[PDB]
Amino acid sequence: GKPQYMVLVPSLLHTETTEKGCVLLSYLNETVTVSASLESVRGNRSLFTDLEAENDVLHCVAFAVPKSSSNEEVMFLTVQVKGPTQEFKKRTTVMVKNEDSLVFVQTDKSIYKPGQTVKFRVVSMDENFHPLNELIPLVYIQDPKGNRIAQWQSFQLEGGLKQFSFPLSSEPFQGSYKVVVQKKSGGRTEHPFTVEEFVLPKFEVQVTVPKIITILEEEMNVSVCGLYTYGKPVPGHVTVSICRKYSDASDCHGEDSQAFCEKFSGQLNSHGCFYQQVKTKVFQLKRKEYEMKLHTEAQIQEEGTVVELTGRQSSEITRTITKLSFVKVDSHFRQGIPFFGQVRLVDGKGVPIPNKVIFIRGNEANYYSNATTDEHGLVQFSINTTNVMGTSLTVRVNYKDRSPCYGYQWVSEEHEEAHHTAYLVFSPSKSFVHLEPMSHELPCGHTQTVQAHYILNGGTLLGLKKLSFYYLIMAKGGIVRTGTHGLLVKQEDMKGHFSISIPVKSDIAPVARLLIYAVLPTGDVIGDSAKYDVENCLANKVDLSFSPSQSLPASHAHLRVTAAPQSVCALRAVDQSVLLMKPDAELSASSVYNLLPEKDLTGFPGPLNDQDNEDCINRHNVYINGITYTPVSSTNEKDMYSFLEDMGLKAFTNSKIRKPKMCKYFPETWIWDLVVVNSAGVAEVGVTVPDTITEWKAGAFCLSEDAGLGISSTASLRAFQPFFVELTMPYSVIRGEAFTLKATVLNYLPKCIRVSVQLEASPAFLAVPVEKEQAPHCICANGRQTVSWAVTPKSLGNVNFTVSAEALESQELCGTEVPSVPEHGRKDTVIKPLLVEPEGLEKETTFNSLLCPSGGEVSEELSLKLPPNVVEESARASVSVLGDILGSAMQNTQNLLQMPYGCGEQNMVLFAPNIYVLDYLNETQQLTPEIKSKAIGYLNTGYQRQLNYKHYDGSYSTFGERYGRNQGNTWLTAFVLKTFAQARAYIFIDEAHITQALIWLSQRQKDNGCFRSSGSLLNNAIKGGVEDEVTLSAYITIALLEIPLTVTHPVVRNALFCLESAWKTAQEGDHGSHVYTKALLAYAFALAGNQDKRKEVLKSLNEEAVKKDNSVHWERPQKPKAPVGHFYEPQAPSAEVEMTSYVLLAYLTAQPAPTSEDLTSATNIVKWITKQQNAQGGFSSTQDTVVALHALSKYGAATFTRTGKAAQVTIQSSGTFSSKFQVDNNNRLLLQQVSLPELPGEYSMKVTGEGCVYLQTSLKYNILPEKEEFPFALGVQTLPQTCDEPKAHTSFQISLSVSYTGSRSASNMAIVDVKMVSGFIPLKPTVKMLERSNHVSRTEVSSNHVLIYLDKVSNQTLSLFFTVLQDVPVRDLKPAIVKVYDYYETDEFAIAEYNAPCS
């Protein structure tokens, strides 16, 4: 044997990965050494790899290349085989690249409810699937518009796992969200996931159909079952339509536009609902047909006759039938060793046809046999190989070209025969080794040997007594296992058995590309390469377990989880509905192998390895010297170099080895935890959700530091209740009216039982059953029993009615079997709250008063007047004690008030006070991290739904691009930017918004004209004069100055000119009449440090104020006096709370320090603003409330007192019962509220101690006057005026004609508050009809309250209409009320009444 080296290196060298390799010396008798130098292109980074050699045996080697700066480097590789006999070297190019960590993701479901929160696990690991601890630089969530909702800074996921809570908002816009995680090495990974309010379908079709159909067939089996919510179909009469479509159906746009077809109808009664056998003789066609369609019209009779016309287009023609497919054909045939062809016969639908005799096209060597199919439609066969160049293979099943009219299309009516042509391997020594491939996927763990066939043909002349033979397995881009096996031959050896065994483990990639080879003393090397598929197995075999079939209320459910010792598991508990929605993301189990980039090495991927052209020995292309001129032109062979190339790695050979020739339902997510295996497993208690009807599918994966990844199974933990029933009660109800309670129990157990129902009476209501008997009724398996009560409420407020139901034990009645004890759950008790509203609308008044004992005693007397229209027992006098001034608003920021926050401004009052209160807590350093976390959550919610108001230009209008308004309003942009100023310090409000909104409203500027407005100013009433270009300019300056920004910035530099010039001109212009402008100017001067003009503004504002009980109160210039005869009503003014709050805040904002005189004036302003502040934290005027609450926040910032520990509150009624309270430092923020039921003013509280105490006093009472004075007009009617038709009881149109009388009151944006008569859910689509009509933008409805967002009033009357639906027959006596009022000042209200049309 002449000297010859051989070394294999995987041409996917990864930076951090230790590149395992192999070396070998073949027939050199002198001991030498080898060196592998890795020189770098465009520079010099040489990684030498020098090591020993063995004359006949190989050995493994591993090395790790340095972290290359370049992303993907195509760097030269040279191996220096140092030998005293001869020196051997070879240069080549290999491709190295930085190996980014594998980061798969979660968020269990890709589709959400609006009001839910995201759970968001992220996991990282390297090529080996054990997790790695890396600092991830960037993770963020993206909306359809590309805006960044949230963001997390550089974190380190310990153990390869770290969760991320993230909430959503009430109405997030729904195109599509996506999760993008950016790795530390550039490339980012994505995960789509959407949110939407899906559908509430009352019943759906579930039909099985032949999704594809034979060209020559008669019958189709079609079953039609309509399941409504759970699988108790209770269906009616269906009329199913099978409409076929011919070729170019409806394309002939003349005399016809339809496709001929036929329809059916049928009855449905039980689980076996409707089984429609479908004849097919007049069906689509045997010629000129494209694709039929399947549409079903399910309809029920005993209930609502709504028809669900469903389109299930799962229907495709299959003109080609009985297709033959190659499932295992040996792609490269060998002359001497037969290759084993294995074909598959199968019907066009997909089922194999057993026992079918086929005919094999042996295109060469004439293999013509009448083989037959197996039970699986399988045929196996071999062909003897003594041939020349190449053999072709084909099947024979039909031979036919039938009667069909046109042969223009490809062969369709017959079976498209399967063709294949194998190519001959380049055998330089007339010899080779063949390896038998495998078709079925290789099982892990269980070892499986593969047979090898060899031939020598006398090539191994020198080789004797030892035929060393080697195998190499390539997976995941690298060599995994090496090994050898011997042969004992001194002959020329033909076909034989050379079985080798490979232990299949999880370490192998999903693809298992396996090569074998044998070195010959002649210098050549023979071998083979085979591919395998491996079932996805992971190094961890996890277990998930429960106590299944548990009761629905049974909280206790132990989750035993066993995995690799001391690993970290990611529990994922969710219902089956989510799995039904969509196949999970790789199931988190299956295609995690697919996640690995470049999983299979097809061979030198990338054009950069175009170095194989080295010799081009085909320069002697002259024809072979012979009698016949036969030139060698093409060699469609596969050399051993080509085989090793197809393996995908560089091969280095001393001798010739290359060929010389060249040139749906409800999600309700569940348990989401991170448990740790206690070296043997872990049990986990899991509280089952009181949502019985769904099946819970549990899956989880675990990861250990040394062990790989894991997956167990998909456990289920189904819960079923035999006596479960759903109550049917109105959401709201009238105290005067009474209703008919209805309750039906649903049996879900096969046991034939008899449940007994019983109601639990309370002193708040009386209940009388509609039936006289009280015995349990005969309700057998899968039956429902309807029971009812005549219920009249007595006490107002919230009442949580409860009803218990259970089957009485050991009672022998109707059922032949009476198993009254099915399971642990027998007593079925459910609770549903009920709202009892008294007669008439509630008037809300506030009598809060700030009293400071200041080391002494203070007292106050409460007076309560009841107007004669007050209904009986409507008064609810609640008094709360708050140490802090802004306490109530601290507790209930979200439900701050009525006004459910539809447009931009109200969303911003939902948003900003959270910022201001949190800043106040940060200043006072009692941050109390749990309330801070609550503030974070609600504030991050509030940042969402502002994007609903962002259009492309960057302006946040009241409605934005939504509903087709390409309008930009500068005021709201300024407000939202002012809020986002301090918002960014907490929740990372994306810089893109503050930069783009700053680019806008700044390009919109004229030199001395300072930010001219395009959108209309709101509530012109607050500003009696025109006052344009002054109010809004002054406001926008302070808004964009609140963000960190000084006079040096160009916009304010050009702006302050306008403010000073405007103040100088107004100094000589109109005498006063611009107090709002002056207050804005006062605050602007306070911000800019222009005290030398600020104090001059303040001195004028002092006289322009109105003083009352040592509490200075600025007053509205036009002096509106709408209220008459009511001292309660003066809590409305919306303009008097700005100029006062603005001058307060300007007083407070002293750049050096708030001076003592400033605090003295602040006390006098705070007294009035607190006495004007509505309870429940309301302070009716809304954006007005934002500004005033920020003013109070800045007041409390400078008016802090940590020494106010001792304080005693002794509130005493003038009658019998008194109450006591204490507010120290830690209770300064804790709300202390009690109920004080007494209609008259019989209350007098005494406060002692140290410091200041805020006493909040409010009460609500119900009245209903008529024919009063209203600046609006409320013309509500019904359809009909009086109902006579029975169908008019359920649904009826309601007229909403609203007009506006006094345009000088300048009320612009107003809403109508529409309440239902105790039993009506309004039709959402009939109200959704409104928005296309002008002056009606958004019409959300919630909890019997229909709200219409009237954009702007008019002298003309605007009529609105919609339709409601009756659910509970609640008709004794109540004329329900409807309200209308303006957003930005609440004193204009035109309460009138519309009665139920049938009562």
Tokens for 782, please give them: 């899968």
Which amino acid is residue 1297, in one-letter code? Answer: S
3-state secondary structure of 597: coil
For 654-714, what is the HEC assignment?
Answer: CCCCCCCCCCCCCCCCCCCCEEECCCCCECCECCCCCCCCCCEEEEEEEECCCCCEECCCC
- Return the H-helix or E-strand segment holding 1083: helix 1075-1088
Which residue carries 């090395």 as its tokens?
A: 63
Please count the other Cβ atoms lying within 10 Å of the Cβ belonging to residue 1303: 13
Listed in sequence order, the residues at least 6 apart from 725 whose beta carbon sits closer than 8 Å to its beta carbon are 743, 744, 745, 746, 784, 805, 828, 830
Burial of 290 by CB count in 10 Å (0-12 exposed, 13-18 middle, 19+ buried)? middle
Which residue carries 């007049």 as its tokens?
A: 282
- The answer to whether the beta carbons of residues 1397 and 1280 sit under 8 Å apart is yes
Query: What order of strands is seen across the sheet that includes strand 148-152?
Result: 111-112, 188-195, 177-182, 138-142, 148-152
Query: What order of strands is seen across the sheet that includes strand 339-346?
Result: 323-328, 339-346, 378-383
Q: What is the DSSP letter of 539?
A: S
Listed in sequence order, the residues at least 6 apart from 440 whose beta carbon sits closer than 8 Å to its beta carbon are none
Rounded CA separation 880/1256 (Å): 5
- The answer to whether the beta carbons of residues 974 and 964 sit under 8 Å apart is no
Please count the other Cβ atoms lying within 10 Å of the Cβ belonging to residue 1048: 7
Tokens for 919, please give them: 């800043």
Q: What is the DSSP letter of 1315?
A: E
Which amino acid is residue 417, in one-letter code? Answer: E
- DSSP letters, 270-320, are SSS--EEEEE-SSSS-SSSB---EEEEEE--SSS----EEEE----EEE-S
Rounded CA separation 1005/1053 (Å): 13
List the one residue out of 839, 875, 869 whose CA is nearest residue 1373: 839
| Angle at 509 (CA atoms; ends 507, 511), nearest 5 degrees | 145
Rounded CA separation 1101/1079 (Å): 8
CA distances from 983 to 145, 894, 913, 986 (A): 21, 16, 11, 6
Rounded CA separation 1358/1272 (Å): 12
Listed in sequence order, the residues at least 6 apart from 624 whose beta carbon sits closer than 8 Å to its beta carbon are 630, 631, 632
- The answer to whether the beta carbons of residues 1082 and 1031 sit under 8 Å apart is no
- The answer to whether the beta carbons of residues 847 and 879 sit under 8 Å apart is no
Tokens for 1195, please give them: 């007041």
Tokens for 820, please give them: 């009254």
Rounded CA separation 1124/1069 (Å): 35
Rounded CA separation 235/228 (Å): 8
Rounded CA separation 466/1038 (Å): 93
- Return the H-helix or E-strand segment holding 981: helix 970-987
Rounded CA separation 157/133 (Å): 6
Tokens for 621, please give them: 């292309």
Breaks (C-N over 2.5 A) in the chain follow: 663
CA distances from 994 to 6, 233, 1040 (A): 64, 54, 10
Listed in sequence order, the residues at least 6 apart from 1332 whose beta carbon sits closer than 8 Å to its beta carbon are none
Listed in sequence order, the residues at least 6 apart from 1322 whose beta carbon sits closer than 8 Å to its beta carbon are 1316, 1341, 1346, 1362, 1363, 1364, 1365
Q: What is the DSSP letter of 425?
A: B
Which residue carries 């503004």 as its tokens?
A: 1097
Listed in sequence order, the residues at least 6 apart from 777 whose beta carbon sits closer than 8 Å to its beta carbon are 754, 755, 785, 787
Method: cryo-EM
Listed in sequence order, the residues at least 6 apart from 419 whose beta carbon sits closer than 8 Å to its beta carbon are 392, 393, 394
3-state secondary structure of 554: coil
| Angle at 1299 (CA atoms; ends 1298, 1302), nearest 5 degrees | 145
Listed in sequence order, the residues at least 6 apart from 334 whose beta carbon sits closer than 8 Å to its beta carbon are 385, 424, 425, 427, 432, 434, 455
- Return the H-helix or E-strand segment holding 221: strand 219-227
Under the phi-then-psi rule, with left for phi > 0, alpha for psi from -120 to 50, and beta for the rest, what region is 1270? beta
Radius of gyration of the chain (CA): 42
The percent helix, strand, coil of the chain (3-state, each to 5) is 15, 30, 50
Which amino acid is residue 253, in one-letter code? Answer: H
Beta pairing partners, 1260: 844, 876
3-state secondary structure of 1134: coil
Rounded CA separation 972/1018 (Å): 10
- The answer to whether the beta carbons of residues 344 and 352 sit under 8 Å apart is yes
Q: Convert 67-106 to b/e letters by CB count within 10 Å (16 or more is b).
A: ebeeeebbbebebbbebeeeebebebbbbbbbbbbbbbbb
Resolution (A): 5.2
CA distances from 1316 to 1275, 1367, 1370 (A): 17, 11, 11
Number of alpha carbons in the 13 Å side-chain half-sphere of residue 1160: 5
List the one residue out of 566, 621, 732, 777 whose CA is nearest residue 1370: 732
Rounded CA separation 827/725 (Å): 11
Q: Which domains does the chain have, with CATH numbers?
A: 204-318 (2.60.40.1940), 323-533 (2.60.40.1930), 543-597+665-716 (2.20.130.20), 725-836 (2.60.40.10), 1266-1393 (2.60.40.690)
- The answer to whether the beta carbons of residues 523 and 655 sit under 8 Å apart is yes
List the one residue out of 433, 432, 431 whose CA is nearest residue 457: 431
φ, ψ dihedrals at 17, nearest 5°:
-75, 135
Rounded CA separation 942/933 (Å): 14
| Angle at 46 (CA atoms; ends 45, 49), nearest 5 degrees | 150
**Alpha-carbon 700 to chain mean position:** 19
φ, ψ dihedrals at 7, nearest 5°:
-140, 140
